[PDB]
Amino acid sequence: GLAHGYFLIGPFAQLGPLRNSDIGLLAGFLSTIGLILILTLGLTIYGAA
Amino acid sequence: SHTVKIYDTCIGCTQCVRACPTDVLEMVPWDGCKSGQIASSPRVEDCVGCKRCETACPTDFLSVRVYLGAETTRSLGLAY
Amino acid sequence: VDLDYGMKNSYVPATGGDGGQGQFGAQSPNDWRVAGTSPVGETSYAGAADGGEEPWFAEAISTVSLDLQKADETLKAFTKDAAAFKIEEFADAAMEELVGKLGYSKFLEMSTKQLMKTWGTL
Amino acid sequence: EMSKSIPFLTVPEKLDGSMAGDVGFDPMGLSDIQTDLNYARWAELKHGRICMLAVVGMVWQEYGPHLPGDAYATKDPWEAISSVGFASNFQTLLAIGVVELANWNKYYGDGTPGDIGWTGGQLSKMNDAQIKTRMESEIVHCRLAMIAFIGATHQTFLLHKGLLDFS
Amino acid sequence: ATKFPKFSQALAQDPATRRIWYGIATAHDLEAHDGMTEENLYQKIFASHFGHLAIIFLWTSGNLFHVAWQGNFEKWVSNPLKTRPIAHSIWDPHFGESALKAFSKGNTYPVNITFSGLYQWWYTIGFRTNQELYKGSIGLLLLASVLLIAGWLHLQPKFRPSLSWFKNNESRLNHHLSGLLGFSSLAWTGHLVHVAIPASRGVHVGWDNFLTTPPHPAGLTPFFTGNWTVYAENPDSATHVFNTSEGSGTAILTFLGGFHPQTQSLWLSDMAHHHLAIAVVFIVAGHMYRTNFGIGHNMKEILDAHRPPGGRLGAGHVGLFETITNSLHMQLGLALACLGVATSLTAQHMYALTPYAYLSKDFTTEAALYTHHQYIAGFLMVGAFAHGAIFFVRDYDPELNKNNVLARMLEHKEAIISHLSWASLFLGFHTLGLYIHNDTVVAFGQPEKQILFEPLFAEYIQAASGKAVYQFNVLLASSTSPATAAGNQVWLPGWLEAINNPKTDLFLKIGPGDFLVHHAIALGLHVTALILVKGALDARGSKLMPDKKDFGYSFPCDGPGRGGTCDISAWDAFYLAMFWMLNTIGWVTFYWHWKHMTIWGGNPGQFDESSNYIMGWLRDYLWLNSSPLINGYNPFGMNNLSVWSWMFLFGHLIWATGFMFLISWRGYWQELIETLVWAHERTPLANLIRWRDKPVALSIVQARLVGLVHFSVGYILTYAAFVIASTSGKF
Amino acid sequence: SVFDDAVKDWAEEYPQFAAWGWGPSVQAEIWNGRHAMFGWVVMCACAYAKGHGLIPDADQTLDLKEWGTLATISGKNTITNERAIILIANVHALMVGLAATISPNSFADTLLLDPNHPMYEWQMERNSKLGGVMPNLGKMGVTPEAELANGRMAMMGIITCIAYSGIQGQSMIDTINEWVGGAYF
Amino acid sequence: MAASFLPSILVPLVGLIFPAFSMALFFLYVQTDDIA
Numbered sequence A: 001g002l003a004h005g006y007f008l009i010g011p012f013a014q015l016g017p018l019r020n021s022d023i024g025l026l027a028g029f030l031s032t033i034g035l036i037l038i039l040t041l042g043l044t045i046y047g048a049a
Numbered sequence B: 001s002h003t004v005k006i007y008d009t010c011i012g013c014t015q016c017v018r019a020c021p022t023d024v025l026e027m028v029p030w031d032g033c034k035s036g037q038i039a040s041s042p043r044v045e046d047c048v049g050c051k052r053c054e055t056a057c058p059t060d061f062l063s064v065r066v067y068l069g070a071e072t073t074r075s076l077g078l079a080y
Numbered sequence C: 001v002d003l004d005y006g007m008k009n010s011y012v013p014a015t016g017g018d019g020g021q022g023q024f025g026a027q028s029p030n031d032w033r034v035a036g037t038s039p040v041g042e043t044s045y046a047g048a049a050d051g052g053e054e055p056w057f058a059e060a061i062s063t064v065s066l067d068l069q070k071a072d073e074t075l076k077a078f079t080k081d082a083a084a085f086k087i088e089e090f091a092d093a094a095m096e097e098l099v100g101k102l103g104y105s106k107f108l109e110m111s112t113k114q115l116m117k118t119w120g121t122l
Numbered sequence D: 001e002m003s004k005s006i007p008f009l010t011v012p013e014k015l016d017g018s019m020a021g022d023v024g025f026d027p028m029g030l031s032d033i034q035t036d037l038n039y040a041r042w043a044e045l046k047h048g049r050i051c052m053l054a055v056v057g058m059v060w061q062e063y064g065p066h067l068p069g070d071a072y073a074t075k076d077p078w079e080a081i082s083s084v085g086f087a088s089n090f091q092t093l094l095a096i097g098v099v100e101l102a103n104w105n106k107y108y109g110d111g112t113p114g115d116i117g118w119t120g121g122q123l124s125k126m127n128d129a130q131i132k133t134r135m136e137s138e139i140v141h142c143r144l145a146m147i148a149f150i151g152a153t154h155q156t157f158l159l160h161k162g163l164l165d166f167s
Numbered sequence E: 001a002t003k004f005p006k007f008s009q010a011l012a013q014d015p016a017t018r019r020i021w022y023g024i025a026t027a028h029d030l031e032a033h034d035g036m037t038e039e040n041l042y043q044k045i046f047a048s049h050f051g052h053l054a055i056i057f058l059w060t061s062g063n064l065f066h067v068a069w070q071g072n073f074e075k076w077v078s079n080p081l082k083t084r085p086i087a088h089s090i091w092d093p094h095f096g097e098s099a100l101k102a103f104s105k106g107n108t109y110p111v112n113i114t115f116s117g118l119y120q121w122w123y124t125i126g127f128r129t130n131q132e133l134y135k136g137s138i139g140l141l142l143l144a145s146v147l148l149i150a151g152w153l154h155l156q157p158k159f160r161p162s163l164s165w166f167k168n169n170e171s172r173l174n175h176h177l178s179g180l181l182g183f184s185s186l187a188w189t190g191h192l193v194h195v196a197i198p199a200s201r202g203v204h205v206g207w208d209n210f211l212t213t214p215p216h217p218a219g220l221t222p223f224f225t226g227n228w229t230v231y232a233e234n235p236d237s238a239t240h241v242f243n244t245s246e247g248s249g250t251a252i253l254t255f256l257g258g259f260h261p262q263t264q265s266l267w268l269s270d271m272a273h274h275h276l277a278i279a280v281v282f283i284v285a286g287h288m289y290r291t292n293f294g295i296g297h298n299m300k301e302i303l304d305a306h307r308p309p310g311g312r313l314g315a316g317h318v319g320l321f322e323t324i325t326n327s328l329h330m331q332l333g334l335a336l337a338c339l340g341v342a343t344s345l346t347a348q349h350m351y352a353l354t355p356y357a358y359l360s361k362d363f364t365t366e367a368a369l370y371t372h373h374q375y376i377a378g379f380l381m382v383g384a385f386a387h388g389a390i391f392f393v394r395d396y397d398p399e400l401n402k403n404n405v406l407a408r409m410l411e412h413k414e415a416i417i418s419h420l421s422w423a424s425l426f427l428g429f430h431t432l433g434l435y436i437h438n439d440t441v442v443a444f445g446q447p448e449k450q451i452l453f454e455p456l457f458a459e460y461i462q463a464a465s466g467k468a469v470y471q472f473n474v475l476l477a478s479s480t481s482p483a484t485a486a487g488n489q490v491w492l493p494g495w496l497e498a499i500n501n502p503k504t505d506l507f508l509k510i511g512p513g514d515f516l517v518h519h520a521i522a523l524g525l526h527v528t529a530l531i532l533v534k535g536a537l538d539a540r541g542s543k544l545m546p547d548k549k550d551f552g553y554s555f556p557c558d559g560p561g562r563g564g565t566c567d568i569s570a571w572d573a574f575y576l577a578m579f580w581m582l583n584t585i586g587w588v589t590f591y592w593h594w595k596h597m598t599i600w601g602g603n604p605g606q607f608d609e610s611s612n613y614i615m616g617w618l619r620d621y622l623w624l625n626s627s628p629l630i631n632g633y634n635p636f637g638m639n640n641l642s643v644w645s646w647m648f649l650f651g652h653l654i655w656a657t658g659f660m661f662l663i664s665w666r667g668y669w670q671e672l673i674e675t676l677v678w679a680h681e682r683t684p685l686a687n688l689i690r691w692r693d694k695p696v697a698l699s700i701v702q703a704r705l706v707g708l709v710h711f712s713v714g715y716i717l718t719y720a721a722f723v724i725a726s727t728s729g730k731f
Numbered sequence F: 001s002v003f004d005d006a007v008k009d010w011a012e013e014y015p016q017f018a019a020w021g022w023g024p025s026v027q028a029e030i031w032n033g034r035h036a037m038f039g040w041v042v043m044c045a046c047a048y049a050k051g052h053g054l055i056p057d058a059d060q061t062l063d064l065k066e067w068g069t070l071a072t073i074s075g076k077n078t079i080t081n082e083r084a085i086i087l088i089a090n091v092h093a094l095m096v097g098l099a100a101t102i103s104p105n106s107f108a109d110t111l112l113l114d115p116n117h118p119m120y121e122w123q124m125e126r127n128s129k130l131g132g133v134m135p136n137l138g139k140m141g142v143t144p145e146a147e148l149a150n151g152r153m154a155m156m157g158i159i160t161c162i163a164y165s166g167i168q169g170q171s172m173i174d175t176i177n178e179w180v181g182g183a184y185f
Numbered sequence G: 001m002a003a004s005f006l007p008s009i010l011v012p013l014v015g016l017i018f019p020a021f022s023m024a025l026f027f028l029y030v031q032t033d034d035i036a
Ligand code: CLA
Pocket: A008, A011, A012, A015, A016, A017, A018, E094
């Protein structure tokens, strides 16, 4: 998780819809957290199966 | 597993047995035809359903019939 | 060695459109759905090979082999009924004469009259 | 044999006379399709009890002391629904729903139809003859009240007279 | 039955991804499920029907709620011709600021404009306010809950109906004719007289006041005295302003004919009288069959009695009663066939005999409604034939039907199929030849050499109904005809005013282009029928596969032997006929749309001249009318049609993607997936994860179905985008 | 009672969910009561901060060019600063809750009854002990019984606050203020 | 609280949360080895 979350924020921060706003970094972090939640759901249901 | 049936129009030509790629069929003694043998399918668990046996059968209509059914690893021809 | 080991699987044949388990069984008795690779020092499943310092290729290590003795013995075990039939039609000691004189595979391959001919020699 | 209420018809087989209030009245044969009459009797008792309370309420809210309050003052039962407000009708609906859903397994059950437990200790010192008499009386009151409610309603929206205004 | 799907042991034991796909695709084929009995089959179908009706009522309640909550129905009512009716609000975080502004034109917030005709229909039936619509929505929501409860209840052990109840033909037919149709029609007449007609005359009649507001000043005295003409006296005048009292009459039942002069739609009194006569006819019809009261017909006796004495029909209709009763597939086929006819009739009659106020002025809505109903009719007809074929495979018993009409169809299937093929070939050869001849002569700059047959028979039919343009003095176009003298007594004046009014769609003027396009439509109908009929009639077997019935309705093929047997099953005939149904309905809707676009554009002559060759269709219909659609967004900006531009491209993409499944077949994909499996098993850090369902290529039949679904969805979405965008961006 | 029959029938109708503690379970009652208590804290804080105007530019709306279309309510009309701020505070709490749900420690009271977690047996024992109409006045202080009782009280208070605010035709903040004797506004 | 807020509240629940949980539930159901 430490390895992946660090680089995942970059695409969102630098290329997301709000990249040119002054809250672009915060939006990138929020997008990264959302992606991590999606991946964690994947891991959870994978383990269950 | 697929179903393979032999009907009594079989003339014991052994062509379906030679055509089978997975050795499902074999010739067995029988007094119903001149050749003195009939086809048999004792190993339908290995039948892939290619229908080469039906392509090989000379009777009209076919004497060997393959009905496709429940798929397994063996019937799907999977190497994995 | 049990002969119905293949048949003793969990495959329950359906009531229609299903040839069932034939001469050896419709499927393996072993559940193929096992875990993926595992860290150094751990096994993914019960009989898995320890990939040593390369567990990521652990599945490329073979734990299933066929040694020639097992091959001969299972050849004899699986064809015991066919040999019993051939001696029943040709006619204990006589079978031991035939299968050592010419061979076991040859004894299966020959015919009852032909074996009646080779039994002429002693 | 023949029906008691309609003497020229054959009784349907389900009306064996066991249930209270049975006089072999089912000319349309509605009981023939049902598996048993338990749900039908639950429904008959529930409808009749509600109609009894509804008729009593129609009379009281027309010639009786209302609870103090501006909203609760109108003597017109149809207008009462709007006058008291959603906030009271909804509480009534929710409490009734709680009682209904708590007794769900009795309504779709195999016990005696109508008996949700609220007995008042009335049927403790009775045999089966007296319990049967009580059940017959309750079912007859239910059946009278349903007709009465139909009458009362059709006299308050088709003529707009009162219930006790016989002019 | 231990894994999904629990209804199929054979599928549940498959170790491949196939197990999932097939489970989903076989969930509603309840007859094939393991351990199914007939009684359980009927009970499960009954419950599923309750669920489906709940879904329908939820959909209707939602339309009502979204219009009430977010629509402009009151503004539309106050000003029908200058308002665009709203379907629902947009909330889409992906929108840019430009998109929000573009989609909020004429409003304060982004909206989709409805093209379903709901506003016109609700306006015609007496809806005037958002509160009334909301009350309707609430009622339908509660009704959906009631239907769900009923579905649950009729699955409980004490409430499951028996098989005898499901097989009671006479009673079900009596109730569905007299009650479901006849009494529903009577109640609808009651609504029209009490609610809709007063609303059209500027009078509010609602739940608040309907018990004390008689729909006619004379009350019910004329009805009970037999002096019924009183209900026809004093209709709305020719100057009647709809929704207001000016020029209004008091007639509640009329036979005026034609259209209301201002709405250009049917008189509400005429529709009320229509539903009253319909109610009488259906209530009477619902008393034909014997239920419990000694009187009435038995259907089996009726069927068994109808055998021609000469014998040209053999055993006649004996055996058909049991065949129909015991076969859900034949019943479903009959239902789908009649529904398809009725849906096509809906499409054909709604455009010509406009039933709803101001609907003929909402051009995009007209086009959308016609296209929608015609495509649904096509789907229903295809379904009818598919279920006929399924009946032949699964339910037909040769001994029960011995020598009856159903068996004799099978007996002369070769003649039937060969003659249908001849008709198809004749129509195709000559229609395509005439189109090509016209194309060629016009290309060489000699349009006077075109072959232009006048649709004389259809023009004669129009004249017979009263159209005067074609100079045929026949029947209703003839002053001295008996038909004219008779009809002038009731409905003929209004009908003649409408039919000879070129501003209406009542019997549009036709010419040679109509002739050629109609023969193209006949080609489509005949070829679609040929495919479906050959599939049904060869479903049980053919010379190439004499035992086809042993293999079921759907199966991939019988292998490469005997010359090759791809697409031999009856399901494959359904699959092939879906393409022809789509092509045919496309020709139909293209014809409708182009003729109406040229009429609405004020230049019918463009259709009349350019429809006689294919290049005219390509250039003056598709190319010319693509313009607003393809400019919904461009390098300079976007407008509210951009969603349709995107959907247009979306449909093209889906259609083309369907081509991949239709053209490339299974072996290639299975071999590719083998290398994919190899790659995943050999990749470190990814081989920590493994599938529990072995990846396999899609099956032969599954790929045909997936290709067909992609093709059909792309076809539908592309055309819907085109028709909506072209009509709405032009007018 | 009706309670035991109700829970048993619900479990029989939804066994897969009833396995994890979903539905009308003691586990769900405990967790929802904990949330209701914390939410009473948050609602009181919101009422107090609205009464004293401690939220900056509460009635001002968020900039569309700053936060984009996600901040819109209808068209280009954006959410207010106060609503966004309240949402963010609750989002802090929700992120805590997601961390607790997804990565519980070994001695933690997990959200769901996981047989593989080291607290499963303790959880089942505790949940079997709790139950009844009146709170156990024998057990007080920091105990599961007191926690359950106070969670029940908080959920009841939420229901009554919603209902009272509805009847009086006023906002929930107004009810909260008028229930503390107008201590906020 | 107002109904005008409902889209921005409900749309993410219908279009993101609900499909994700429904797909996870269906995945778990199809991977279950003993369903009955
Ligand atoms: C497939 C091609 C493609 C690409 C490159 C993009 C790119 C983009 N899209 Mg678009 N988009 C696409 C197709 C694509 N889109 C499609 C098909 C649709 C649907 C019609 C959309 C609809 C859409 C919308 C609605 C939006 C975007 C947006 C964006 C931007 C932000 C996306 C983001 O942050 O993802 C995050 C990316 C990641 C989390 C990971 C990226 C992949 C990594 C970098 C690969 C690394 C591999 C590595 C090198 C391997 C070895 C490493 C080592 C260990 C050896 C970005 C420029 C957003 C925008 O605002 O645009 C300006 C936006 O709002 N897109």
